[PDB]
Design a protein around this nucleic acid. Sequence first.
RNA 1: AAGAUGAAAUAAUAAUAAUAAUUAUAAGACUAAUAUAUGUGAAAAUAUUAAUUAAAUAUUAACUGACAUUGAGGGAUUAAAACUAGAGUAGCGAAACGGAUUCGAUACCCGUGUAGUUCUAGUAGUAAACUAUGAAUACAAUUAUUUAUAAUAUAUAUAUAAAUAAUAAAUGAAAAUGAAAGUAUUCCACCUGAAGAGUACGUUAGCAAUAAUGAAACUCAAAACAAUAGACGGUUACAG
Lengths: 199, 92, 131, 115, 22, 91, 84, 66, 141
Amino acid sequence: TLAELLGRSRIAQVANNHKPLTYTGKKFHPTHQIIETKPSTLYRQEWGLKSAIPSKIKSRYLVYNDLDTLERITTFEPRGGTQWNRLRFQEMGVPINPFFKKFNTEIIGTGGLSYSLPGKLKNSPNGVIQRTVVPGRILNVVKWLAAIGGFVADVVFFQSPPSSFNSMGDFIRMKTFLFEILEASMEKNGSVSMHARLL
Amino acid sequence: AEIARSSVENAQMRFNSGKSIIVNKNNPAESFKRLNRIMFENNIPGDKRSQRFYMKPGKVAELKRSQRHRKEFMMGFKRLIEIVKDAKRKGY
Amino acid sequence: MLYELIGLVRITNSNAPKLEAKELSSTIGKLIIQNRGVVRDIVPMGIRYLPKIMKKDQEKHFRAYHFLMLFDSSAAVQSEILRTLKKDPRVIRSSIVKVDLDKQLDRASSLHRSLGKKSILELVNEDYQSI
Amino acid sequence: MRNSENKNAIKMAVELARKEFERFPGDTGSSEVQAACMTVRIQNMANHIKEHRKDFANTRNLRILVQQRQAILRYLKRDNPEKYYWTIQKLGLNDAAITDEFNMDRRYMQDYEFF
Amino acid sequence: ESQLLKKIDKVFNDETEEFTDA
Amino acid sequence: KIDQSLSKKLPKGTIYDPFDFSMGRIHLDRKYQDIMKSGANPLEFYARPRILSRYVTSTGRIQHRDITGLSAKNQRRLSKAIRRCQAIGLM
Amino acid sequence: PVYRLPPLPRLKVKKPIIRQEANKCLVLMSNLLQCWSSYGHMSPKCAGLVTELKSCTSESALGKSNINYHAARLYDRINGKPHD
Amino acid sequence: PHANNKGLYKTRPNSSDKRVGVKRLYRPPKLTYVEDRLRSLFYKQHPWELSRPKILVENEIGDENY
Amino acid sequence: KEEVVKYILHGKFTKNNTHLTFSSVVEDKNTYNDTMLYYLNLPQKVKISLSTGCLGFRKAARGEYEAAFQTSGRMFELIKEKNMLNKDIEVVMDDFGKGRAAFISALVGKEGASVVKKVVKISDATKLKFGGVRSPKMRRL
RNA sequence: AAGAUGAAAUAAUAAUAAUAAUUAUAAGACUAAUAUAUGUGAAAAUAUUAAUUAAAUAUUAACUGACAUUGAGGGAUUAAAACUAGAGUAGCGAAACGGAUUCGAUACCCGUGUAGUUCUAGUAGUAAACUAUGAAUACAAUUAUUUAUAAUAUAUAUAUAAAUAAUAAAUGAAAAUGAAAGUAUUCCACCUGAAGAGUACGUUAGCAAUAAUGAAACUCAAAACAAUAGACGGUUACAG
Ligand SMILES: [Mg+2]
Ligand SMILES: [Mg+2]
Ligand SMILES: [Mg+2]
Ligand SMILES: [Mg+2]
Ligand SMILES: [Mg+2]
Ligand SMILES: [Mg+2]
Ligand SMILES: [Mg+2]
Ligand SMILES: [Mg+2]
Ligand SMILES: [Mg+2]
Ligand SMILES: [Mg+2]
Ligand SMILES: [Mg+2]
Ligand SMILES: [Mg+2]
Ligand SMILES: [Mg+2]
Ligand SMILES: [Mg+2]
Ligand SMILES: [Mg+2]
Ligand SMILES: [Mg+2]
């Protein structure tokens, strides 16, 4: 019947989420599902939602709360950032088991961030990749923290900070550095604590 | 007698009026600005003009209702302007 | 009826501040018990500087020993206790408030109730109290 | 009970009056039981008005309660006259006090020396 | 009376823990 | 150097987007910048001048419900407790 | 809490406030004046700043709110009035 | 003919039973599904699964053969 | 013995005039509770008293901004003249008259630049009615 | 020198050391924030604190079995002002006395200020005593907030009620009302052109002021309500 089909409809498939779209608190994991629309449907403003999204939006990803509201607007945001962070984690290669053998709401292991297994290494034409190197940005003059590929980590130093740090001061984030991710762990609340080393 | 003089400073500091500032030596005007901020947060200036003359309780109630209504109307207007700005940002 | 009394006793002897509070507590408790009353609790709040330089009779007080007494008693002797407190030079300030017993027979003082201990049984904890 | 509130004493008195006027156990709505409970509450309110003669709000409440007792006893007369006379005799009232128009006017308070 | 003297001595004469707000 | 208000600090372990390293993020954060809200009875806190003093101005004026954010019930109990504390010699 | 205004004849700000940016020449002049105040006039320390001013004002000495429009355009949609 | 959880037999209608409920008939019924709970659990247990993009354009619903 | 713990400069800024008063807080080194009560509330002695009329302003000129400004300047010059900058100063302002801003500007400005180096605290002593004597009726102008 | 005002001046501000400041005494009256009269109360009213007594809430269970609604007359309470006795009298302040302004001031502004405002014991029973909207009952389409309960696991944008705001239908001369100014039922009070007039006379009650009841002749074709378009305002804001 109509009720069954509505229960199995993709709009129903999106779980009920009502958190503030614009959030200024600490962000540890995604809070809204990312809705994707194909370019052909974007051309006609069709996102699979109740109403047509305004033609001003050019991005193909958004995160929404209400299909419709009293103000006759769809409560949405044209942001699809979080997936990239997840995908960027897959580029790092650092692995993080509950995925092996009344309702509990705890984040189960890594909550979809990474489903890799620790015991594997990367072969490269140069040879076996012993240690993975990714570029990042040291943020502040403080341990020292770095924005590396969508995640904030605490960098473990090697003797003294390079003098560039002291010379630049608060403009440190302008310059890129190359780090090696020592370890990745997941805290209970869902934060991803990674330790890296500035080469 | 000696513990007396030890405790005089703490006791005297306890009886604070709450309308006071320790002057910043570098910028004395900043301390006066902080004092004026305290005055306006305590509604002392408006209060003094309120007590200057007498106002009948019916007129006092009328003014209080009017002021509360204007405050609520301003809050609602700010909410509507926020909705307008968000809709403009999103392209509606 | 359960009555919570909060007394602000004056400190005159700088060496033994608790003496006057002891004498006042003895007097009030003796009155309560001898007039068919019960003194459920005496909570000894500490010495505190008064918010202002409060005046009783001619003496001017700047600090006081605060103390609390939870006692079950009748209205008439409660008013008598209040009258004795008001005329006593030792008591700078006094206040008696009813603690309602409509639902629970045993209730703690305002301080313990604010902390989270609703009853005095919780105050003295619960082991072998299911007998 | 001497250390408790007056409301508790009136509660006990109301229970006693109900159990003394009840037709059967659990009977609380019979006109005689209602009249007895109203009588106890009326006596308490009358004492309060005697000690507080400028409390016009509670004087009005007492007047309304007395008129309520009058109405319920008049219904009992219309329904069960034998129990009506039994109840008014037990409560210390007569037929005239129930049937006649009543207001707690100053004339009543002067004639019967309420204060 | 005996319990009154005992408790009063305990709370005041004895240096028991006092409910003084820090 | 950069004034602290002009700089955005990403906390440890938090995810971010390139927008975060922008003045717009700082402005947005600025734009969107206890016990009595925990199901407790403010009347019980009438002999506790400190916790009551948390909810008054420097001069001792009770703060409006718009400032405190309490419920009307707890707001009324807080006002009553503060006035009682004033009357009994405390506060 | 949320406050809902009545059906209003209009939705308009009486005085829209715009963020005019203070002219670069004025702030450079102020910095030069503070330099000569502290180090002294024609002091060696901040003379370099003078050069900047000499260029910044060489060509010329000194070198918008749509809220009401959008509010009027969008009011009928967002006011949330009852149907008819 | 038996007692309820509190141990009381139902002998007379209570206040809620004696109120006409025509509004219940004429209100549009709220649609509730069991899945809506489990879904809320799943994305609570795996928040990063939300980051994986979803397409709400339906394709053809009737064509599903699963 | 009369030692001076501090000085106090008070300014009452009413609608029609401004009254500035300079005073010293005298102390005498010599029951525990009485020693406390003396310590918390010290005696106060007036040293300099000024009103705008003392500066020559007359009638409505007394309440003007320039009158208050010049009165504050003369005040500070007088504290310097009698050499009462040796101990720190406490500034108290009573009312929100129109000369209050004049006093602030004169103090923070070059006129009181000497005095400001010794002030330590600024306080308000505005007197308000929580509820009390009936105020005069409104003037139907 | 102070005090006041638009600016000033006042028979009683100050050299008899005033105003201002710091203390110390006595007096009365009033109750800042919270605060929305949200609420409570039949209305009038009522928000500084504590206590004694009285009354007021929802649900469940049991009981009575129409005992109900309204209500002429009547009864009670009833702001401010007023009066009668006592005490009180700090501020404010009719009247009065003066100073200003003005062609004139009999007014607005200013000073001194009597009664009164305050308490106790009474008289009286009037207000734009208003929601200008009597009470009760059945029904009536929505939305949004709160407010108060009941759950279920902050989340159910949770359900049941009442308050508030905007409405649909309906009603209305329209303004507008909107769960009553709607659809119906029951009871009570009131109205029949303007003015004369809530006036006169009489009667009832009060210490009195007064309160209740309450006309008639004569004059006229008027009189009023809502809304429309103008003019006007010592009417606001925006631009040029
Ligand atoms: Mg009846
Ligand atoms: Mg108040
Ligand atoms: Mg009736
Ligand atoms: Mg009044
Ligand atoms: Mg008299
Ligand atoms: Mg008087
Ligand atoms: Mg006067
Ligand atoms: Mg005129
Ligand atoms: Mg006059
Ligand atoms: Mg009077
Ligand atoms: Mg009377
Ligand atoms: Mg009249
Ligand atoms: Mg009338
Ligand atoms: Mg009328
Ligand atoms: Mg009509
Ligand atoms: Mg008459």
